[PDB]
Design a binder for this molecule. Structure first.
Ligand code: CLA
Ligand code: CLA
Ligand code: CLA
Ligand code: CLA
Ligand code: CLA
Ligand code: CLA
Ligand code: CLA
Ligand SMILES: CCCCCCCCCCCCCCCCCC(=O)OC[C@H](CO[C@@H]1O[C@H](CO)[C@H](O)[C@H](O)[C@H]1O)OC(=O)CCCCCCCCCCCCCCCCC
Ligand SMILES: C/C(C=C=C1C(C)(C)C[C@H](O)C[C@@]1(C)O)=C/C=C/C(C)=C/C=C/C=C(C)/C=C/C=C(/C=C/[C@@]12O[C@]1(C)C[C@@H](O)CC2(C)C)CO
Ligand SMILES: CC(/C=C/C=C(C)/C=C/[C@@]12O[C@]1(C)C[C@@H](O)CC2(C)C)=C\C=C\C=C(C)\C=C\C=C(C)\C=C\[C@@]12O[C@]1(C)C[C@@H](O)CC2(C)C
Lengths: 177, 168
């Protein structure tokens, strides 16, 4: 009856055990929202998209700062400020990436709403397993848990890197030391 | 359910299997409120127009017709051809063809039996049975889509950088 994460709180009604990373940590009861097209399905899809985006962004920042930029690309070690140097010399790359992300996000929203309507697609599912790393069950749950935990950690990390780069105008590991 | 192209999206519910080049790609559901034959005709018309346009752009940046008016790049050829009246002739004959097309598409939508884009233009055969016709229709659709995207890229690159045939 009590949430596993917060023993002083009752179990959130909509979070039983199903989703990976579920420990009952919903103090504000946001999982019970059923308005403005927002429900547990939409919240989970948003959480998974945030997890994946944060993982990609944190990996990119760390890669560029440690191993350096790719040939022909600007340096500076400040990832929040090197973006304007890339846009100053290769605006077409940024524009094409933005257009591609826009199209993919329109497709993602359509897929999310459709799967919410005629329930056949789990939240965050895009059938993207080209290498077959999660075919069999009893490993899919473990992979989902790993992805969720890594994505939450990378969300926090990427938000921290964004704020550090905006404020200190220095690199992430530069702030570290 | 679970359209072939986008495996996580539902089938567009208007494209089951009985159209050439039908991989179930309609995420925004254009076929849900527009006739399928109308959209097919529009797509095939775009394919043919853009194939001709890409070939003409690339060729005219290499080979020029005799005369001083034909000595401009394809990027600047529009303002020269419109002034000389060269594009007026193309406009006149294209308008004639498109009025006949108005009649044809109206008849196709109101029964008839004319397949979308089927003008029966076939001096040579190149398509003897149903299988050959289907294969060549798929080839035409794929080549036309590729040429539409290719002309888009060619025009955008040439406008961005006023370069010759290599528009990099
Ligand atoms: C420009 C084109 C474009 C379009 C049309 C979309 C469309 C969409 N995105 Mg999206 N996105 C884009 C570009 C785009 N994205 C780019 C370039 C990125 C960064 C790589 C993202 C990152 C992103 C994330 C991380 C999420 C979406 C989500 C969504 C969906 C919810 C839209 C909504 O209600 O937001 C309303 C618009 C807002 C700005 C509201 C957000 C306000 C928050 C509180 C800002 C917090 C800032 C703090 C620091 C929708 C399908 C969400 C989703 O799929 O949920 C299911 C989601 O979680 N997008
Ligand atoms: C959220 C994900 C994300 C985003 C938005 C970016 C964004 C960027 N990266 Mg990047 N990167 C990422 C993840 C990401 N990266 C990951 C996961 C890795 C590791 C594989 C890298 C490795 C990487 C390198 C090695 C370099 C960049 C560079 C760049 C910049 C120019 C390239 C470009 O337009 O990207 C779109 C590019 C393609 C689609 C190709 C741009 C600011 C370049 C740069 O200027 O860095 C300073 C560069 O040299 N990235
Ligand atoms: C810690 C990293 C990590 C892990 C463990 C997973 C794990 C998973 N992802 Mg995933 N993903 C990640 C990062 C990760 N992701 C990032 C950064 C992105 C953004 C590019 C995505 C984008 C993504 C999509 C679009 C989809 C998945 C899917 C999946 C599931 C099946 C595929 C699989 O076995 O992947 C195993 C992954 C690894 C072994 C990581 C090796 C490095 C599985 C639970 C699919 C899913 O949810 O199906 C239901 C799916 O459609 N992921
Ligand atoms: C994900 C984990 C994580 C880690 C390891 C760090 C680590 C660090 N952060 Mg940080 N941060 C994080 C998340 C994290 N942050 C998040 C989620 C945010 C909010 C978006 C911030 C916002 C933030 C700011 C605004 C600043 C730091 C600073 C720092 C550095 C000084 C640490 C300290 O105690 O100084 C005290 C240190 C390298 C400081 C720094 O760069 O020092 C020069 C600094 O000014 N962080
Ligand atoms: C979308 C189709 C299209 C359009 C609008 C244009 C437009 C133009 N072309 Mg052009 N061209 C095209 C296709 C096209 N071309 C193709 C496919 C080729 C390859 C043979 C060429 C080869 C070409 C050359 C070599 C030159 C031009 C030039 C020009 C410019 C002025 C003279 C002229 O009209 O061309 C004259 C066109 C030709 C001599 C060949 C056209 C052959 C046609 C397109 C193929 C048969 C299709 C058939 C007749 C369709 C019937 C239509 C129906 C309604 C009845 C003008 C901007 C001239 C210029 O100023 O260059 C900058 C020039 O020197 N074009
Ligand atoms: C790769 C080029 C290509 C291909 C394979 C086709 C294929 C086809 N076209 Mg077609 N077409 C094209 C370009 C192409 N088109 C262009 C650029 C135009 C504009 C002038 C047209 C205008 C056109 C008309 C007006 C008609 C067709 C028709 C046809 C079909 C029977 C004729 C045939 O076998 O064509 C053979 C073509 C080739 C072998 C291409 C090589 C040429 C060098 C077939 C599906 C007919 C149809 O709808 O039948 C069902 C018909 O009435 N086409
Ligand atoms: C049909 C496929 C195709 C191919 C092979 C290329 C190929 C290329 N494009 Mg491109 N492009 C295409 C379609 C294509 N484009 C489309 C449909 C658009 C949108 C209209 C663009 C918009 C575009 C821009 C804006 C730029 C390129 C650039 C480039 C070059 C890098 C390379 C030669 C770049 C380049 O070198 O331009 C000078 C560049 O800046 N492309
Ligand atoms: C930003 C604009 C907000 C848009 C609101 C969309 C839905 C939000 C909503 O209705 O839930 C608002 C959420 C949902 O609140 C939940 O509602 C459920 C019934 O609908 C149950 O009653 C839950 O117990 C209750 O917590 O409540 C809060 O988050 C209030 C927290 C305020 C903290 C201030 C510090
Ligand atoms: C209606 C809609 C879409 C939809 C739909 C459909 C289509 C109807 C389908 C469904 O049926 C429903 C629904 C709702 O899904 C809404 C669209 C979404 C919006 C409104 C898009 C918002 C995106 C904004 C982002 C993601 C911007 C991020 C900015 C960053 C800046 C980066 C910086 O580097 C910059 C530039 C400068 C640097 O110095 C430092 C920083 C600041 C870090 C980080 O990235
Ligand atoms: C949109 C795009 C790029 C957009 C870039 C933009 C907006 C950038 C704009 C800017 O930089 C400028 C210009 C100047 C700056 O000052 C301002 C900004 C704004 C910064 C590229 C698309 C590029 C699109 C591309 C490359 C498409 C390739 C498509 C292929 C290969 C298709 C293949 C098929 O069609 C066939 C062949 C057969 C079919 O049946 C099957 C498939 C597979 C679908």
């Amino acid at each position: 009856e009590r949430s596993k994460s917060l023993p002083f709180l009752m179990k959130p009604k909509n979070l039983d055990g199903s989703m990976a990373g579920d420990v009952g940590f919903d103090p504000l009861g946001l999982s019970e929202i059923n308005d403005v097209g927002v429900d547990l399905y939409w919240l989970r899809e948003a959480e998974l998209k945030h997890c994946r985006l944060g993982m990609m962004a944190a990996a990119g920042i760390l890669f560029v700062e440690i191993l350096g930029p790719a040939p022909g690309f600007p340096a500076g070690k400040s990832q929040m400020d090197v973006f304007w140097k890339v846009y100053a010399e290769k605006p077409s790359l940024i524009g094409a990436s933005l257009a591609a992300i826009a199209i993919l996000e329109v497709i993602s929203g359509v897929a999310t709403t459709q799967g919410r309507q005629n329930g056949d697609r789990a939240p965050g599912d895009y059938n993207f397993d080209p290498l077959g790393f999660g075919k069999d069950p009893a490993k899919f749950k473990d992979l989902q848990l790993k992805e969720v935990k890594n994505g939450r950690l990378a969300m926090i990390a990427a938000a921290g890197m964004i704020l550090q780069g905006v404020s200190t105008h220095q690199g992430a590991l530069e702030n570290l030391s | 359910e679970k359209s072939k192209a986008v495996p996580f999206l539902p089938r567009p519910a208007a494209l089951d299997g009985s159209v050439v080049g039908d991989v179930g790609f309609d995420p925004v559901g254009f076929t849900s409120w527009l006739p399928l034959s109308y959209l097919q005709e529009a797509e095939i018309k775009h394919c043919r127009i853009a194939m001709l346009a890409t070939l003409g752009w690339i060729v005219a940046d290499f080979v020029h017709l005799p005369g001083a008016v034909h000595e401009v790049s394809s990027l600047a050829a529009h303002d020269v051809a419109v002034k000389s009246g060269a594009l007026a002739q193309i406009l006149i004959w294209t308008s004639i063809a498109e009025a006949i097309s108005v009649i044809a598409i109206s008849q196709m939508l109101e029964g008839s039996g004319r397949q979308p884009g089927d003008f029966k233009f076939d001096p040579l055969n190149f398509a003897k049975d149903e299988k050959s016709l289907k294969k060549m229709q798929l080839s035409e659709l794929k080549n036309g889509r590729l040429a539409m995207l290719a002309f888009s890229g060619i025009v955008t690159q040439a406008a961005l950088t006023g370069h010759a045939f290599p528009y990099m």
